[PDB]
Ligand binder design. Structure first.
Ligand code: XX5
Ligand code: NAG
Ligand code: NAG
Ligand code: CL
Ligand code: ZN
Length: 597
């Protein structure tokens, strides 16, 4: 029989052992992220250590098939993955150290503690505490300790191992036909096979570059507007001309300025559109949330969460007695097993993140029925970009209103608009420059453009030009600030958040028009419309068996990342920021300082 047949099986003989062999790891791997005992650690790095050996072995027993000599395009690209020597390319008993490094980094993060100065016994984990503070405290000082202490106490520990991490990981990358590890994560976005749809790795970069320009204006005015209302509540601390201090951003990293809402609300007297409060005066809990969320997908086609999910997902920190990584994550253990690990809180933040995490799931399912080594979203952007297509709709006063956290509200005042839209900006635009800059530095390093002795160097120089933010305390190259933001210390590429942000609005400008909407998309409902659910559905199911470029094209006109639908969402808020800012200065100083004073 044909040779494009010794594989059409070799693959399927693979999709069946792997799934279980995987699930064997995902399951143990889960006992860890849910209880950082240690007994659980080993069990875990034993389950994947074999899957390691499994995949490794099946890599050689795979490349036994020549490149082409294969049709049915799928069968070929599916082959692609396997042929690539995994991180096995490493010195067997070397990659071990990587894990040793990887595992720690994780624990350090979800376990590290800073302890109150005036009471060696009042220690705070990052969740919550360093977190609740960096999200609520208004005491420039409380804010300040938390910020520094975290980076100081834990951050510093990370350093040593991060230095080893880039190295080890790099060697693995480059010894795999890539320029570095970054070139690797840029891989995800790559597509070859198809012509006119081919997308290169070096592209993803300059494609973010370009798309970033049209994003700057809207940022600056948004940044120069919140340097204002931020001075208004921390006078004598921030210059009306030089990037705000890192600890007043609304959260440990300033990744999201969504908590600077009460300090920046444009018309703070209209009905708060941060139903974080209405939720408490209704006693909303974890379930109720993930139930009110699951209720959304079901309104637009997509199924209800499986009873298996409801019986294993950890939707609240088990508190003292068992320590689990609290970062919200949507798990796929395969074999039909779907779970979500999130230390849910009754915030409006956790209301949306639920719509996120869930979205991950609704996707993981939507492409379940698909060759195992192919079920995986067109690309990271897409996976991230999905739950955000919901939060976009399920956060509009409209929805929020009808849902409950906003009984019969003041019509929709031409002002509740700039009001609602400023929050979004806070969350969505706030992150773009932060999201970008971090990955850039992340690339620069793997690349090489930043020698070990210049890490915290470029990092803050950068945080200054691009993000438009400065550090409250000179950080020596003893630190490692960009290793105290989960994502970093636990692998996870970061640029999917950038890309996800732009995909987000393209998919939305299409579905509204696929539910017959007739206003700006920042008024677009999308709930109850199967016309919409359906469309998106026919998209999710294809897994990663179709270049995202084509997939994108088949869903929303363009076959690539478009910044304009976003610029359209925030056009109302922009022109207004224009006004409000008329007197205030748009831009910032890359030489200022809140301490050099
Ligand atoms: C790739 C995964 C390992 C991490 C990621 N989780 C989210 C979690 C998230 C969504 N929106 C906000 N956050 C941050 C966060 C929320 C909560 Cl309730 C607790 C904590 Cl510790 C962090 C992210 O960091 O983007 C994701 O699902 O894409
Ligand atoms: C797997 O690794 C071996 C030795 O490092 C190498 O010869 C082989 O080409 C790799 N797999 C492929 C087909 O790239
Ligand atoms: C092409 O051949 C493969 C393996 O023989 C088969 O499973 C697949 O269904 C065919 N094309 C598709 C993707 O339907
Ligand atoms: Cl930082
Ligand atoms: Zn996500």
């Amino acid at each position: 029989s044909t040779i494009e047949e010794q594989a059409k099986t070799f693959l399927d003989k693979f999709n069946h052992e792997a799934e279980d062999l995987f699930y064997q790891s995902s399951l143990a791997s889960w006992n860890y992220n849910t209880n950082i005992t240690e007994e659980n650690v080993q069990n875990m790095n034993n389950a994947g250590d074999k899957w390691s050996a499994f995949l490794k072995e099946q890599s050689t027993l795979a490349q036994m098939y020549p490149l082409q000599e294969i049709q049915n395009l799928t069968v070929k690209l599916q082959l692609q993955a396997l042929q690539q020597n995994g991180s096995s390319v490493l010195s067997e008993d070397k990659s071990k150290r990587l894990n040793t490094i990887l595992n720690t980094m994780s624990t350090i993060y979800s376990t590290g503690k800073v302890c109150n100065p005036d009471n060696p016994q009042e220690c705070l984990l990052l969740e919550p505490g360093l977190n609740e503070i960096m999200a609520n405290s208004l005491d420039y000082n409380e804010r300040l300790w938390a910020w520094e202490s975290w980076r100081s106490e834990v951050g510093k520990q990370l350093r040593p191992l991060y230095e080893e991490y880039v190295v080890l990981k790099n060697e693995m990358a480059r010894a795999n036909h890539y320029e570095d590890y970054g070139d690797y994560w840029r891989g995800d976005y790559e597509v070859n096979g198809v012509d006119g749809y081919d997308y290169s790795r070096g592209q993803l970069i300059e494609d973010v570059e370009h798309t970033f320009e049209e994003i700057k204006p809207l940022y600056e005015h948004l940044h120069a507007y919140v340097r204002a209302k931020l001075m208004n509540a921390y006078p004598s601390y921030i210059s009306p001309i030089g990037c705000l201090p890192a600890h007043l951003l609304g959260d440990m990293w300033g990744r999201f300025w969504t908590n600077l809402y009460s300090l920046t609300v444009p018309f703070g007297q209209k009905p708060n559109i941060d139903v974080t409060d209405a939720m408490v005066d209704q006693a909303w809990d974890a379930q109720r949330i993930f139930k009110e969320a699951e209720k959304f997908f079901v309104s637009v086609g997509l199924p209800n969460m499986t009873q298996g999910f409801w019986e294993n997902s950890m939707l609240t920190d088990p508190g003292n007695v068992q320590k689990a990584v609290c970062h919200p994550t949507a798990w796929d253990l395969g074999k039909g097993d779907f779970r979500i690990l999130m230390c849910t809180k009754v915030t409006m933040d956790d209301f949306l993140t639920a719509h996120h995490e869930m979205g991950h799931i609704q996707y993981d399912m939507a492409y379940a029925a698909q060759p195992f080594l192919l079920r995986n979203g067109a690309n990271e952007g897409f996976h991230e970009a999905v739950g955000e297509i919901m939060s976009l709709s399920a956060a509009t006063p409209k929805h929020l209103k009808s849902i409950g956290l906003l009984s019969p509200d003041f019509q929709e005042d031409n002002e509740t608009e700039i009001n609602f839209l400023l929050k979004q900006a806070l969350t969505i635009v706030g992150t773009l420059p932060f999201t970008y800059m971090l990955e850039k530095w992340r690339w620069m390093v793997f690349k090489g453009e930043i020698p070990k002795d210049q890490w915290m160097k470029k990092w803050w120089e950068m945080k200054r030009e691009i993000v438009g933010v400065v550090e409250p305390v000179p950080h020596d190259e003893t630190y490692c600030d960009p290793a105290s933001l989960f994502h970093v210390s636990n692998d996870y590429s970061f640029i999917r958040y950038y890309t996800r942000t732009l995909y987000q609005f393209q998919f939305q400008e299409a579905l509204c028009q696929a539910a017959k909407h007739e206003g700006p998309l920042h008024k677009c409902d999308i709930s109850n419309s199967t016309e919409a659910g359906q469309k998106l559905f026919n998209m999710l199911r294809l897994g990663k068996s179709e270049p995202w470029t084509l997939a994108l094209e088949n869903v929303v006109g363009a076959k690539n990342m478009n910044v304009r639908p976003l610029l359209n969402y925030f056009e109302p808020l922009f022109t207004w920021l224009k006004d409000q800012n008329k007197n205030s200065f748009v831009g910032w100083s890359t030489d200022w300082s809140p301490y050099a004073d």
